[PDB]
Each structure stands twice: as structure tokens, then as C-alpha cells.
Amino acid sequence: MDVLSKGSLKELLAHLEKTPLEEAISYRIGTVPYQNVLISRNEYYNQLYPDTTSLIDGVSREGQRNVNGLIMSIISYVVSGSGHYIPNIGFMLLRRSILDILTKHDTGLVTNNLNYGIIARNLTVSKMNCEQRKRMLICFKLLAYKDGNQNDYEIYLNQNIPLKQIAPNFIPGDMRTVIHNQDQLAIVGIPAYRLTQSTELSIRDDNAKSYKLGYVDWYNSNSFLRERSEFNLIRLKDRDTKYGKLNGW
Amino acid sequence: KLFETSPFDPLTIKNNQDVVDKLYATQSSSIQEVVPTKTFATELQFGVTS
Amino acid sequence: DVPFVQAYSKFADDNPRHLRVKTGGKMANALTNVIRSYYSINAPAIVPQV
Amino acid sequence: ELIKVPTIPHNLVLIQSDNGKHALIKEDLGQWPVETGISLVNQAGVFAVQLANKLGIDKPFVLDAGSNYFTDTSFIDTRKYCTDGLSPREIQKALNRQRAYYDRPELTISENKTLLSQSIIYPDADGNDVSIIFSGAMSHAIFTYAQSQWNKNIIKLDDYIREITLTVPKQYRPRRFKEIEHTHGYVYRELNQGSLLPLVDANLKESSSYYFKKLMSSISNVPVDAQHVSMLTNRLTTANAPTVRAITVLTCMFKQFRIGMTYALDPNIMDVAAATCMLLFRPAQSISDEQYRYCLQTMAVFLTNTTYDIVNNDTIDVLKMKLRNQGWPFVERYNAVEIDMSVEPLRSPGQVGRYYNPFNIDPLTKKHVEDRLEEFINQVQVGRFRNASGNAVGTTLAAFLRACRDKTSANWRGYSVLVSRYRSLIPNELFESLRNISGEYNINPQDEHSFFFALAQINADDEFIGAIDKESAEYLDEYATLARDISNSLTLVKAAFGPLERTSGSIINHANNLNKVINHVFADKPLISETMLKILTIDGTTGKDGYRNWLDKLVGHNYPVYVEPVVNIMNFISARFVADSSYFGYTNEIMIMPNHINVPVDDRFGFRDSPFCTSLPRTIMGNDVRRISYNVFSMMEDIDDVISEGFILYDAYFNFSYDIMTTDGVTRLKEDILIVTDTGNDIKPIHFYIYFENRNDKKLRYESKMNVSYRLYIKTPACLLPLSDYMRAQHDYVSPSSSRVYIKDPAVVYTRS
Amino acid sequence: CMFKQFRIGMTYALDPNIMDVAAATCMLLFRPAQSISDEQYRYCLQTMAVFLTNTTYDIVNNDTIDVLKMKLRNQGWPFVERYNAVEIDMSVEPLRSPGQ
């Protein structure tokens, strides 16, 4: 919910700095990722509604133990708000931030053999919307720069024309590029249109609307942070400033 | 009556600034989130002139 | 040279100066780079949209 | 305030002959005299400010010409015709009169509509409105450049708030702007902070004394809550309590504020109590190494019953060992604990402020930084001092130490709040730079002990907090004025003065130039505000003298000075003054030729015997024209032979004026060309009477050939423009959107009240 | 009470008195917890800690809510929590209108 509300690249990258990797892990068993299932949608039909489960969902799913699964669970967290179940990860990795996992060599994860086409198929890319695809390309770019496989990032972009057009433009090592970005990456937010409490058919759509309606309640809750009315009550670290910079970069 | 005193007369305003000044004049009639007092400034610079 | 000074200032966002090359300013760099990206897809797109 | 300019200064006139054949467009920027033999750039700077005053661009401004328009009566026009600038109606009348002379048909309806629709107002994508009008080239260039420079300081309200968020404390209520001010609110702020160091570094004694006195005049007004033992009870006093309280705050407010105590010649049990209290309840940063020894020596003299002679050569370590063996454990100075400020200090962008916690109390532990305080007091109680069997000295000292410890442990939070509030008043540079150079705030030994023994609770009522809020605004104003004064003085030194050598000529030149600057600066309205004068006259010297010594020091400085927008505006005008001289009524060279010599002249304006040329001829009749400098020409005694051939006078600045007459007549100068005296030659003032030409007037043709014998030629002024080229006068001005509100008071918080 | 989106705020002095603590504890007791924000909650805890415990605002800065609650409970102060308000179910009779 908090990750899906990040609109700018600066806000999203700042959130990935604070958030430890444990929030990407789910600790819940879930079910098998790819499976044809019959679900109940009684607001529209009496007959059970066919659907196919996918990794990009608001629910836990079983994920492979290797480094491939860990990367996929991070991306699924960013684009869907919920991760996967990867059992028995060391405490050292779980306390590290998500950005450190994607952009640092200190962690023991080896990602040099990652294939971007295989990952994009597993985390179904034909099903994502434009904002979800932009968030995925941010994660791919961070992995490429840490690994030195910046050419593999470009070949992947050239094989898919629509992804190249919407690919976010920033340098993972320069903060000036992040500030200049005008991309909008907010999956959930305050809706200009009228949003009702009705259910939706697909698992992805119904799960997304749950996050959308939850954010509106979170918007009007006391936990939400109103800058225009309580800016002096905020700690100096968390206050909005023009000179705010990520570690390194 | 929707208001005890109207926020401003629409026929008197001519630009966005007139609305702001009228809103400040009639703000005593409305229930205010913060009742105004003397302002406190934490930033002041004087530039060179001609 | 006032007409040239005014034209160069609008194009380059910087006043013309003697002992300088008069490259064209930021606008020249952007035009040069977008031409590179238009020719083929292998060229990088490194001009911010802002 | 931010002024709003309704109309655009086109500065254009139209001159046409009586018969209508010839017309021209002239831009009148005035006449400015130029003196030769001295630097031209210095004169240009003086005229630049006057030129900016004429165009109304000296002060920050925003152009509103969007409402200066009208709409035609045609159905399909739907265009806005700009009122500003030279009206197309005048051009239409001038063009129609020209056509009447040539028997051409008048302007048809189609061309009339095109000409009268040349000046328009149209909006752009960003919401601004663009005015296309007829105006002068230099008037357009200067006006548009000043618009760009002022616009750099106009920023959105939300952007301004983001810059000042870190400096906003928590005690103050947030301010609710209207919803229009959040969407369409703009402010004019400089947003550059000049360094205060040049004044502070040059005058450390005067600056420190000024700020210490100002702070102490306010801390002393804080509301407060109301045998050897016989000796220390008698010395107890309270009349100097307010002074010692403020010294306590100053020591904890600044990084290094050193104070000293002068003990009596014969140390008493008073002196040992004062020494112990200062070494225990004062920051180690405020205690110098010399004062550490002198306090240690006083302890040894009384406790060991030894006179000052033996201990005068003892080092710190020797004194500590001697005192410790006797039974005195209080031989160390203790470092205070730094408390970080909740908000960023004023005039300290991206910096963290800190202050020392009073009475050497650890905030995390809430007791004294020395963990052996209770054990140490026990040793003093049971120890034997003054080489006597009696324990009167030991027990009475422990009693006072316990009272001082209890008093400090209960009143420490009140003083911490006072230090925190007063620390927020000073910037970071003053915190690190101000020093107690002159020992004007020494503390008596009786005052030091009585202060800690009779410590009183600090009461922070509403009146005191309200008083400090007034002082905070006053302090902020003073810092801004000094930064502007420092910036002005740093610019004056670079432009005026230079290096100094070991020659009597250089010293005399420096002294005379310096006095001229000081006299001019202090004449009429002084350049320097009264705040800087107060600082420089603290010692006793007058305001003129204090400023004079500071300017001498600043010579040769490497201090970076920020380039404000009004610097660039004057610099831009000064460059155009030198580059385009004919716009302002002066030129760099003139030509004197006999009448019978035919020179190529400008023929676009249809002038009879035009005195203007496109450029002064390089060759005449196959030979280069002789060029003579003015100084050589002034001393010439064979001038009668030289003027027969013709020459070009250069190496001087020539002021000229011309009056274009509508009728036809002989083009002549008002006065004679030159004046010949025994003490040199000179060129008389140049004033032209230019007439339009009718080629078939035999009378005026013969007069030009016969009556005038010599003619003067200058380069054609660039302000002149033929009527056929009126489209070269079309220029674009951009005015910001009318849906902008400008906020005069951009403060984001209210007083608690 | 009518609108959940509205909020209640306060500003105390740099040195709180007994009235500032009295005002702070009256808000946390008899105002909805949905009206008091998390940032206001920390400020109300800080002003109570500054008075009841011997500390200043600069020291209790960068202190989490849990740490402030522990400080006040050890000193003997039990009013360190917000209290939610119960929702009263209201109906307006139709008459000519449909009803709400």
C-alpha cells in the first residue's frame, strides 16, 4: 500500500532505502503460482468465475528458493504490494534494504546470470499496466548497473518496442537524474473518478481495488501525514527538503 | 441561508488577487482552523538596489 | 549587433561573449542528441523530457 | 514590494518631410556627455543607473500589458490589437503621405488591414500573453534582459516553503494560506545568504563586544524565582546575580567563550570554594590552560599551607600530584555535553547547530559527568588539610559541595531551555568565530560561589517568551542588513582601490583616493546602514574613521561575492553604452573634408548634403585618409595646411546632437568647426541642422556648393531607421499570466500568543 | 464528531507548565483517537515527558512513541495512550425527502 502510493522516482527510491527485505517476503504459504482455478464472484454471476492465478497479485504465492525467486519477490512487492514465500532466508539478507539488495555488492547474492526475458515472462508482463511495467524496468536497470550488464538491459529494451518508449530515464548512480524525472508511478492514489465499493472479476483487478479503497481509508486516517498542516511537527530527517540525497549516488 | 455573511461578492472582484484580499477581510466571520496572529519569520535577505 | 545578441540569447539562454566559441547553448546539445536517437534505435536517448 | 509596469517604453518618434517624400523612425534614448582622458567604463556605469531609471527597470518589476488591447468591428477578426508601442495608424498616415507625393494610389483596404493588425497580443502555452509592438532595438534589448534577471527570483510559494521547512521550530502554529495562494502563489525572494565573516574576521574585538552586550542586556532581564562557615556566609551576595546568570548562558551558547577569575592575594576558604565550583560546574571549553593552572595553584596554596612562590614554577601534572597526595580529588576540568538543536539554525543552510548543556550534566544520565562525585565528597569530608589535626576545613567544604551539587541538579533544565532559545538567535558562523578577546566579563570569587550556592529557578513566563520573539525579528533584520553592507563594501574595494608598494607616490595616491571614496560614500544618504556603524564605533572612533580602516583591510581580499540581478542589468547596459555609442549621442571619430572633395554618404533618408556615412571612408581618391589624434591636432601650428587635404580626428569622444528639419534648406552646423587659439586648438560643439532635399532647387544647390566651404562627417547613428524598414522595429514582449497572486508576507507560522 | 476527516491540533510552549500537561491529557482522554494524528500524538507525549520527567524538547527529539511511553510509565504516568470513539448509528426520517 505504501509502496504503491509512491508517485515520483525520488519517493519510490527513498522508500526502497528505508524498507528492509523482510517486507518483500510474506511468510505465508500461499498456493501454486500458475494454476487454472474457479472462483466465486456472486455480484455478477451465479456460475463460478474461471481465472488463472499469477505471481503479480496481492496474495502470497510459492516461490523458488534461488536468487531468481528473491528478485521476483522484490519486483512483485513493488508492482503488486505483496511478495512471495521463500523459506529460510538468512537474517543478514532480511535486515538489508531492498535498494541494497538490488544495487550493492556487499550482499552475497550473485545475479550476473539473470535473464531479463525469463523474469518478465514469469512475472507476467502482458498482464501488467503501464505504471507496473515502469516500476519493473526500474528494478531491471538497478540490477544491470550493479552487475555491469548494461548492454543486456539495452538488448532487452530493443527487442520490445513498447517497453523502450516507456522506460524510465535515470542513471542509477547520479541523483541529479532522479530529481529531473517527471514519470508518474502511482498505482494507488486519490481517484479523480468516482470509486465505489463494488467487487471486480479478475483476481488482479479485485485485489488492486482492495488496495485502492484501503489507501482512501488510509488517506483519511490519523496515520496519514499532512505536510501543509503539520510540517513543523515532522522530524528533520523526514521533512521534505530540496537537498535530500540517497546514500551514495 | 447558506452563509451568515457571504465569503465575498462575486460582482466586485476583477482578478484572483481581489478574491484573496476579500477572503482575508471576511475570515473573521467563518470558523477558522487557526486564528491569525503576528507572523514569525525565520528567513530574511536584503538584496542590493540601484 | 543588438539584433544578433537578442536572437542568440533566446536560442542559447546565454549572452554572446567575445573570446568564446558561441556553440549554441543548451538548445544545440538537445537538437544534436535527438538527431542521434532518431536515426536508429541503438542510439541512447539521454535528453531529459524536462 | 514587486512593482507592476503597465506600459512598454517603445521610445520611438516618426519624422516626415512637409511634402511627404521622406520619413524615418528615430529612437530617442537621450544625450549623455562623455569626458575624454578618463576610463569610459566608469562613466558608463553612472549612466547605466540613470538609463535604467528612465526605462523603469531599476527595481524588481513584472510586466502587465495583457489588458492593453482592443478588438476590431469585423466579424472574422477575433484578434487583440495592442495599444502599446508606436501605433500603426501613424505609419499608415506616413506611408499614405509618401504615396501622395509620388501620385501613387493610397493604401488599399487589404494592405490597410494588414498594417493595422501588425501589433497584436496573443497567449502562449504556459498562459503568458505575448505583445508584438513597434519599439527600439536597444529599448527592447535592455527591457527584456532586465525582465529575465528579475524573473530568477520569482518562485512558486510551494518551492519557497520547501526551502524554509528545516528552519521552522515546533512551538509556532502553522499558517493556513488560501487555496488560490497554493495554486497561483508567487513570491520574490533573493534566496542567497552572504557571509558575515569579512566583518567578524577583520574586527573580532568590536564585533564580539557588540553581540555579547546585546545578548546580555536581555538575559539579565530573565524572570527568576525567589569560623570558616561564618566567613563564607558573610561573602554571600546577590546584587550581581543577573550578570553571572547571563555569563553562564553565554559560556554554554558559544563554542569558545573564556572567562577568568581573579583570586585574592591571600587565598581564603572562599577562594578554594570558588575554584572548585568553576572547575566542576563550568565547561572545560570555557576554561583556558592558564586559568586551569591558576585555579590549581590557589587550591594548593590554601590546602597545603604553601605560598605562591614554590608553586609558581610547578607544571599542571606536578600540581595535580601534590594536591591528590594531600587528599584533594577535584583536580580535573570536565567537558560539557553537546545537545543538538531541534531545527537548523538561521543563516546556516544544511548545517546542524549544537550547544553545551549547563552545569556539566549529562542529558542521558541527568547527573554530573563525573561518576565519582559522591566518592570524592566523602574523601574531602574525612581528609586532613592545612597540616592540622582539626577537620573544620574538610567538613565545611564537603557541606558546600553537597549544596552546590544539589542546587545544580535541580535547576539545570531551566538554564538548558534558556541556552537553547538564545542559541537559536545567533548563526553558526558567529557561534564558531566570536571570542572573548578583552576580559570585560571577569567574575569575582565571591560572585562565583554565591551564584552556585544561591542558585534560583528560572521562570519562563509568557512575557519573556514574547519578548524574545520580538528580538528574533530584530536579530534577523540586523543580519540581513550587514550582509548587504558587506557585499556593497566588497564590491567597492575591488573596483576602486588596488595594491600598495613601498614608494611615496603609491602611498600618497592610496591616501587621497581613499579619502575621496569615504567622503562620497558618506555624503547625502550614507551607503552603509547604522547597524554596521554601531559595530565599527564600539571602540570609540567615529563612523567615518571606523569604515575607513575596514576598507583598507579588505584590499586584496579573495572573498567571493555573489552576482545579484541588478549587477547584471547595469553590466549589460554599460556594455551596450560602449559598443553602440551612436545611440547615446557620442562617437569615437569625426571627419573634416573640404566641400569640393566628393565623399560617399548615406542616401537612404533623403537628406540634403547628408553629414552621415555608412562608415568613414578608408580611401578617398585612391589614397587612405589621414588620421590624427586629438592631442596631436590640438598642438598643431600648421593646421591651415593640414585641413586643405582633409583628415579624420580620433582618439577622443565627440558629443554631437542633430535637429532634423521638415522643410528644405542648407544643411549646416550651428557653430564653426574649430577654434584656433595660442594655447592649442579645439573642436567646437557639434550641432547639425539636417534638411530634406528637393533635387531641383537651384538656389539651395548653389548655396551648398559656395556658401559652406568645409563639411563635417560622422558615422550614421544606428537609432535612425528609414520608414520602408518599419518591420525591423517589430519586437516581442512577454507578460506573465494574470492568474498570479503575489504574497508580501511569506511567513509559514504564527506566534503562539 | 460529525466528520472523520477533520483533525485536532495543539501548540505548547517551549517550557510546558502544569496547564500544558492538563490540556494535553484532556485531549487524549475526551477526543477521538481518529482526530489526533500520529505526529500530534508524539508531540503530546513529548510535552508530558518534558514536564513530568526532567528533560527538554531537544533531548526527547528523535524519540519514538514507544520510548516516550516507557519513560512516562516508569515515572508513574499512566495516560500515554489514545482512546477510540464509538460510532453512533443515526437515521433521518424520510418525510418528503427519501431519508438518510
Automatic annotation (TrEMBL), chain A:
Pfam family, one: Seadorna_Vp10
Domain of life: Viruses
The protein, known as: VP10
UniProtKB/TrEMBL annotation, chain B:
Protein name: Vp2
Covered range of the whole protein: 102 to 151 of 955
TrEMBL record, chain C:
Annotated organism of origin: Banna virus (BAV)
Stretch of the intact protein here: 52 to 101 of 302
Annotated protein name in UniProt: VP8
